[PDB]
Subunit: 139 residues, 2 copies
């Protein structure tokens, strides 16, 4: 499971690995995470069962230490044809899709995360962080 | 009911954005149109305890908790209502039904069929394949 393999796989092929089993899915999740860089003092966690809702064959969450909000990277599958990066405030609002990608673009995700982090450190509100990330994300 | 059918994805997100009270009222209005099968519970997301992906998200769960279904509203993530079935452990999983416009009776019917098949001892894999046919997926 190289970066190129992760990029060429369609929505059904993501659902196919989830369908193959828990160990197969876990492998896929780790390969996605291996391509990503979590910002300093943030945690990065993948979903291995349905603890994150189970909606996406791969779901990776990135959370700042204070945990006021998180971002979730959601893979192609039955729900969405494209990779989706969302920002969710605790309590569900504000919320936005800040970026969509047709093909897995790893460096782009990590940069948006790096941007989210520094904006957070710099004391920007969640609303302002969403508005900025959407512009950075072409959204 | 008619307002729910008439609202586009962006109005769903505008209500969640307006505030927690406004979102709660929208969640309850959706839930009021639906019927949970006997011995199942129905719960709506009020914050981000179901992930917060959808302006309205309603979960339907049998008491045995081997699996559940979630109805997910239009918004940023999806232009359409989706009904998904999630097994314990995240697999098997499927979208069993998609709706461009909220069809409350069709959701309740799909849920009653899932409950019916489950009692009759169908595997979750088989319930998925059957509900997808019933749901037009």
């Amino acid at each position: 499971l190289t970066l190129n393999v992760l990029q060429t796989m369609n929505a059904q092929e993501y659902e196919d690995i989830r369908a193959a089993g828990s160990d197969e899915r876990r492998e896929l999740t780790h390969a996605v995470m291996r391509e990503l860089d979590a910002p300093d003092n943030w945690t990065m966690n993948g979903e291995y069962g349905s603890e994150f809702g189970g909606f996406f064959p791969v779901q990776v969450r990135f959370t700042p230490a204070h945990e006021r909000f998180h971002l979730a990277l959601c893979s192609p599958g039955d729900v969405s044809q494209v990779w989706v990066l969302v920002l969710v405030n605790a309590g569900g609002e504000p919320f936005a899709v800040v970026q969509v990608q047709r093909r897995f673009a790893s460096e782009a995700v990590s940069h948006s995360l790096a941007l989210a982090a520094s904006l957070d450190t710099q004391g920007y509100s969640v609303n302002d962080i969403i508005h900025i990330l959407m512009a950075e994300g072409g959204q």
